[PDB]
Amino acid sequence: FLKPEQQLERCRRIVRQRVDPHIHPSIAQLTVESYDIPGEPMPSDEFFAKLDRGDIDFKPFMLGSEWGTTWGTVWFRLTGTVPAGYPKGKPLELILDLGWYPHSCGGHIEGLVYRADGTAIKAVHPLNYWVPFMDAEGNAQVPVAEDGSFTLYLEAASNPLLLGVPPFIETELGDHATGKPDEPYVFKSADLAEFDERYENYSVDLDVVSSLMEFADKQSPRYWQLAKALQRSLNAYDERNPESVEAARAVLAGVLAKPANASAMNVSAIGHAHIDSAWLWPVRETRRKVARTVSNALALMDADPDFKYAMSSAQQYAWLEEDHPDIFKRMKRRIEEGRFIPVGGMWVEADGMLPAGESLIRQIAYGRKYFKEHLGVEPKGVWLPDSFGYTGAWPQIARRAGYEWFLTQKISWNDTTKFPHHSFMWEGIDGSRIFTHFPPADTYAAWCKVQELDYAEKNFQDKDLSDRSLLLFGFGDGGGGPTRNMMEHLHRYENLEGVSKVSIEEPNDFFDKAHQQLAENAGPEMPVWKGELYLELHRGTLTSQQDMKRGCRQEESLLRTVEYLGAAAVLSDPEYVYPREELDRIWKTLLLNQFHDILPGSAIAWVHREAREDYRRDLKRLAEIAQDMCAVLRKANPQADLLAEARISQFRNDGASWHANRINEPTDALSVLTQTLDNGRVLLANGVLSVTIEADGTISSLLDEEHGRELVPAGTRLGQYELLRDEPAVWDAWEIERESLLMANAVTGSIESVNTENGAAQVHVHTADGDTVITTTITLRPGSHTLDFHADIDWHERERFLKVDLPLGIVADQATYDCQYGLIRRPIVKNTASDEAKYESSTNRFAIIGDAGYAAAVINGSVYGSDASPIAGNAAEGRDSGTMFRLSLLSAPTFPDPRTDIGSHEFDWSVVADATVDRALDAAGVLNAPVLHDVPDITPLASIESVNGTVVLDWMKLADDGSGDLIVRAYEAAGGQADAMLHVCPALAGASVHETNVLEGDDLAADLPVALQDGRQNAEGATLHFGPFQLATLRITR
């Protein structure tokens, strides 16, 4: 006799047509005048200065017309007058429609509102386009006269929508703002209206009841009680009589006052608005987005108590402080009272896999320094909601910096497997554990719906040990933030049957409570995950926009040398001044370039063009600074001999780590013999290697003497190029897919020349496709166990992917790749579906593949992506066995950048025959060290001598203050236990050594091991004890 579906349809119609219009009924219409800026935006300071002195025309504008260019700005002057004595007990808001596309947000036009003074009120957004004007008492935001006239200003940004409802469509609107109406938007509405809260309360009540009905288990009493209440309330509501809206509200009161179930989860909600530093828009638009988001958050705090908001990146704080001092002051006032929570303590939200360990440490250091010196807040957790995987060295770095918990939600995007836990201990490759939580709502920007709460509650993977989870609600990836409607729904969700129990809470408190509950319930059975956090998605991010990875690695490798040279020069000349501020600026630029959408290479052409210019400029400047420091050192060291060309490579084998050594040094080995065989083949042979190069420019036989090993399986070619068809269905730049593999096409070349420059055999190969030319140089040096490859490529392809094959002839089950501060192991044999998901992993400067008694290594210059597969032999054909290892070189995506990586590229790699961990470390360090000129071969400042084990002295620098102390960062590399001795230069005689944390703060956790027993000692002769991947940090005081 009662049909619930009919009630739901009737409720939807009534809410859309008869209730929502009565919220914000217009009472006046505003006059609009326009002023266009087709080029780059004018700062608000300059605009208001010009406006108050004149210089602005404000041509008349009529509602319903189109205003914007492709990336230009439009300033609107809005004039109005209130009716006679109108504000009779209503807040009297202000509605501004800019022609919003309904089914989207934060991907297109927006704007801020200003008072003639020059201070912002609140931004306007697709679902947030109300601006507070007055109150019931009559207190206004802007000067209103006896006539009642008032004026406001509105800065409107016209940004194109690069993600339509058909996603991933190629466009040319992503660079060099043009000044043409590529897609104009209509204004069509600007009104002054009153705000009736009764109708919004009724709308929210109806929405909550109807949405609860969609998950309420038909054939349960709750479902039918809700249906009856909805029907009675809809019957009681008459649109002719305004007051009846209250009587209807008295019918839904019964079902909305029912308490939550005793077994429901406890949800902690914190306001959030993720902002990407540069993704589908330039950074200059990101600054405006940050300002608008903070304006919205401050307005929401003014309009509602019990609301809190968390903001993360320090660079965005710095931009806001520099650009909008008044917004910064208001935000600081809110921070001081504990309603605006800064989180993270990093410069930006960097990628988890690609940046080096020093990059992560510097991000933490600079972010923490900014937070301490500008906001007076010390975060206790790492806040990285969106990142394409995490390295596995993160837990130790976070634990040794002072953090206590970790936050992430990206792992929910996995292709194949479901991660076993949401609340757990993440343990690194060393043993340090941190408390990690994955928000089960599967998003960092929730809309506060019953659907999201139900999905989160039944998605939680720890229902047997915990009942606590964290909710991040707001609009994200382009700014926006929480709205008034979200909070008005969350107020209902506090104690409601069929829903979890929601409460606004600071994330620190949530993490404390959740960890306490987990530790109390679990005991010994507490969830632990050891290793890295591999993301089964976006595997093409290791190869896209190769210039980004190239510049990142090169700038780090040059910064290490520059900092070491500065430290050495300061200790040698009291009259030398260390360029601290310029190096800080360069470091901050690099850290900004290391963001989760810039370093992977998944942004528009504008962003990557700017990043390339930054890389070029900073690399040139760093080279010049290094030359200056070398000149100072030579002037202060007349006794040493100059080196025409030399490199300083950390961990050089044979007890000569931080010494500067020539590119070409005299050797006992004779010149490398060359020979041409019967059919164009070339036979290179030094004392230790025998290389055979076929007429196609491919290595067919790499024979190792004094071991008898053939490093190339029969029937395979080493150094052969493969072209794959990469046309993914989704996320073109982000993705390489399974089907792209198995559509490989080998590319064939030929030999052109053989040379012997300095006793080294050199072979030149040309490979062609048609507008795509690769020139390869194969080099063998006297006495070297390594074979070198250099490549110059002219990439002119489209939707193709380039790899090079390196068959090795070693049967191994797993492969050892280089991690940030150690080693990681990944399967070569893929038995299960989870294994096959890791078919394209990351390698950091080298990889090792070895059986019980023999290993070979592959060294790379600036390559990051690679894959490994088994080669199964057949004694009836001659193919023996082995491992197919392939390096990813280039890709040609189309969506965000329509012409990606079209041009000239350089690549370097090498194969080391009889390789151990140490030998691979030597090869990787030497190939990545920069080359300087006229370098004195002074003795190293500090040295680590390993009695047993492999310990790498990774970094030397000066302390981040005026003390002049020497900071040393070292770690255990092999993976076992190591014992080491510390030695110092003659200048550091009588100097003291003591252990600190990664931020030099001298305060360190008791749980973590120290590796410097007996504490403060003398620097010369100090004894060190490293566990597996220990990462010790020492401070040496003169």
Question: Can you say which residues are annotated as belonging to the binding site for Zn(2+)?
Answer: 274, 276, 386, 596-597
R_g of the chain computed on alpha carbons: 32
Q: Closest separation between CB of residue 104 and a copy of itself, Å? A: 32
Q: Closest separation between CB of residue 819 and Zn ion, Å? A: 24
Question: Who's near 320: CB < 8 A, 6+ residues apart?
Answer: 287, 290, 291, 294, 327, 328, 331
Size of interface with a copy of itself, in residues (CB under 8 A): 151
> Is 386 among the residues that bind a copy of itself (CB under 8 A)?
no
Select the span of 2-10, 125-133, 396-404, 614-622 touching a copy of itself (CB under 8 A).
Answer: 2-10
Q: Closest separation between CB of residue 276 and Zn ion, Å? A: 5
Please list every residue from 179 through 218 that binds a copy of itself, using CB under 8 A: 202-203, 206-207, 209-210, 213-214, 218
Q: Angle at the Cα of 552 (from 608 to 789), degrees rounded to 5?
A: 105
713 binds, among Zn ion, a copy of itself, none (CB under 5 to 8 A by kind): a copy of itself
Tokens read off for 129: 């386009």
Displacement of CA 59 from its chain's centroid (Å): 44
Which SS3 state, helix, strand or coil, does residue 113 take? strand
Among 50, 333, 372, 463, which residue sits at the site for a copy of itself (rule: CB under 8 A)? 463
Q: From 68, 144, 127, 481, select the one nearest 299 (Cα to Cα).
A: 481
Query: Is residue 96 within 8 Å of 155, Cβ to Cβ?
Result: no
Select the span of 269-277, 462-470, 660-668, 761-769 touching a copy of itself (CB under 8 A).
Answer: 462-470
> Is 725 among the residues that bind a copy of itself (CB under 8 A)?
yes
Structural gaps in the chain: residues followed by a C–N separation over 2.5 Å: none
Alpha-carbon span 568 to 633, nearest angstrom:
8
> Is 995 among the residues that bind a copy of itself (CB under 8 A)?
no
> Is 270 among the residues that bind a copy of itself (CB under 8 A)?
no
Give the helix/strand (H/E) hosting 768: strand 761-768
Number of residues that make up the chain: 1038
- For a copy of itself, give the closer residue by CB, 168 or 885: 885
- For a copy of itself, give the closer residue by CB, 167 or 254: 254
Tracing tokens 């030999």 back to the chain, one arrives at 751
Residue 199 φ/ψ region, left for φ over 0, alpha for ψ in the -120 to 50 degree band, beta for the rest: alpha
Query: Is residue 74 within 8 Å of 158, Cβ to Cβ?
Result: yes
Q: Closest separation between CB of residue 159 and a copy of itself, Å? A: 42
386 binds, among a copy of itself, Zn ion, none (CB under 5 to 8 A by kind): Zn ion
- Per-residue binding letters, 663-702, with a copy of itself (x by CB under 8 A): ----------------------------------------
Q: Closest separation between CB of residue 664 and Zn ion, Å? A: 47
276 binds, among a copy of itself, Zn ion, none (CB under 5 to 8 A by kind): Zn ion
Q: Closest separation between CB of residue 20 and a copy of itself, Å? A: 6
> Is 1027 among the residues that bind a copy of itself (CB under 8 A)?
yes
Among 130, 394, 651, 895, which residue sits at the site for a copy of itself (rule: CB under 8 A)? 895
Select the span of 175-183, 587-595, 633-641, 722-730 touching a copy of itself (CB under 8 A).
Answer: 722-730
Among 146, 575, 654, 877, which residue sits at the site for a copy of itself (rule: CB under 8 A)? 877
Please list every residue from 943 through 972 that binds a copy of itself, using CB under 8 A: 948-949
Residue 121: CA atoms inside 13 Å, Cβ hemisphere, count?
22
Among 101, 215, 447, 529, which residue sits at the site for a copy of itself (rule: CB under 8 A)? 529
Query: Is residue 783 within 8 Å of 686, Cβ to Cβ?
Result: yes
Q: Catalog residues that contact Zn ion under the rule CB under 5 A.
A: 276, 386
**Residues linked to residue 29 through DSSP beta bridges, in sequence order:** 191
**Residues linked to residue 882 through DSSP beta bridges, in sequence order:** 871
End-to-end Cα separation, the chain, in angstroms: 91
Query: Is residue 844 within 8 Å of 818, Cβ to Cβ?
Result: yes
Among 644, 677, 729, 931, which residue sits at the site for a copy of itself (rule: CB under 8 A)? 729
Q: Closest separation between CB of residue 903 and a copy of itself, Å? A: 17
220 binds, among a copy of itself, Zn ion, none (CB under 5 to 8 A by kind): a copy of itself
- For a copy of itself, give the closer residue by CB, 46 or 906: 906
Among 146, 1007, 1014, 1015, which residue sits at the site for a copy of itself (rule: CB under 8 A)? 1007
Give the amino acid at 216: A
Query: Is residue 864 within 8 Å of 842, Cβ to Cβ?
Result: yes
> Is 9 among the residues that bind a copy of itself (CB under 8 A)?
yes
> Is 894 among the residues that bind a copy of itself (CB under 8 A)?
yes
**Residues linked to residue 794 through DSSP beta bridges, in sequence order:** 773, 904
> Is 873 among the residues that bind a copy of itself (CB under 8 A)?
yes
Please list every residue from 803 through 832 that binds a copy of itself, using CB under 8 A: 813, 825, 829, 831-832
Alpha-carbon span 155 to 111, nearest angstrom:
5
Query: Is residue 909 within 8 Å of 863, Cβ to Cβ?
Result: yes
- Per-residue binding letters, 248-267, with a copy of itself (x by CB under 8 A): ----------xx-xxxxx--
> Is 222 among the residues that bind a copy of itself (CB under 8 A)?
yes
213 binds, among a copy of itself, Zn ion, none (CB under 5 to 8 A by kind): a copy of itself
Q: From 187, 78, 188, select the one nearest 141 (Cα to Cα).
A: 78
997 binds, among Zn ion, a copy of itself, none (CB under 5 to 8 A by kind): none
Please list every residue from 733 through 772 that binds a copy of itself, using CB under 8 A: 733, 736-739, 741-743
Alpha-carbon span 535 to 537, nearest angstrom:
6
- For a copy of itself, give the closer residue by CB, 384 or 711: 711
> Is 241 among the residues that bind a copy of itself (CB under 8 A)?
no
Backbone angles phi, psi at 492, to 5 degrees: -65, -40
Q: From 831, 704, 871, select the one nearest 780 (Cα to Cα).
A: 704
Query: Is residue 532 within 8 Å of 392, Cβ to Cβ?
Result: yes
Which SS3 state, helix, strand or coil, does residue 419 take? coil
Beta strands per DSSP E along 204-337: 266-271, 309-311
Q: Closest separation between CB of residue 982 and a copy of itself, Å? A: 18
Select the span of 229-237, 297-305, 781-789, 790-798 touching a copy of itself (CB under 8 A).
Answer: 229-237
Query: Is residue 845 within 8 Å of 818, Cβ to Cβ?
Result: yes
Q: Closest separation between CB of residue 1030 and a copy of itself, Å? A: 12
Alpha-carbon span 849 to 868, nearest angstrom:
10
Among 531, 680, 903, 1001, which residue sits at the site for a copy of itself (rule: CB under 8 A)? 531
Q: Closest separation between CB of residue 596 and Zn ion, Å? A: 5
Select the span of 166-174, 370-378, 485-493, 876-884 touching a copy of itself (CB under 8 A).
Answer: 876-884
Select the span of 360-368, 615-623, 655-663, 875-883 touching a copy of itself (CB under 8 A).
Answer: 875-883
Among 247, 519, 730, 987, which residue sits at the site for a copy of itself (rule: CB under 8 A)? 730
Tokens read off for 1003: 């305060």
Among 480, 481, 896, 940, which residue sits at the site for a copy of itself (rule: CB under 8 A)? 896
Q: Closest separation between CB of residue 652 and a copy of itself, Å? A: 20
- For a copy of itself, give the closer residue by CB, 128 or 1030: 1030
The pairs formed by 218-227 with CB atoms below 8 angstroms and a separation of 24 or more are: 218/4, 222/497, 222/498, 223/4, 224/2, 224/4, 225/255, 226/255, 227/2, 227/4, 227/7
Binding residues: 274, 276, 386, 596-597
Residue 148 φ/ψ region, left for φ over 0, alpha for ψ in the -120 to 50 degree band, beta for the rest: left
- For Zn ion, give the closer residue by CB, 75 or 595: 595
What string of DSSP letters covers 707-758?
A: TTEE-S-TT--BTEEEEEE---SS-TTT---GGGTT--EEE-EEEEEEEESS
Among 228, 513, 796, 1038, which residue sits at the site for a copy of itself (rule: CB under 8 A)? 228
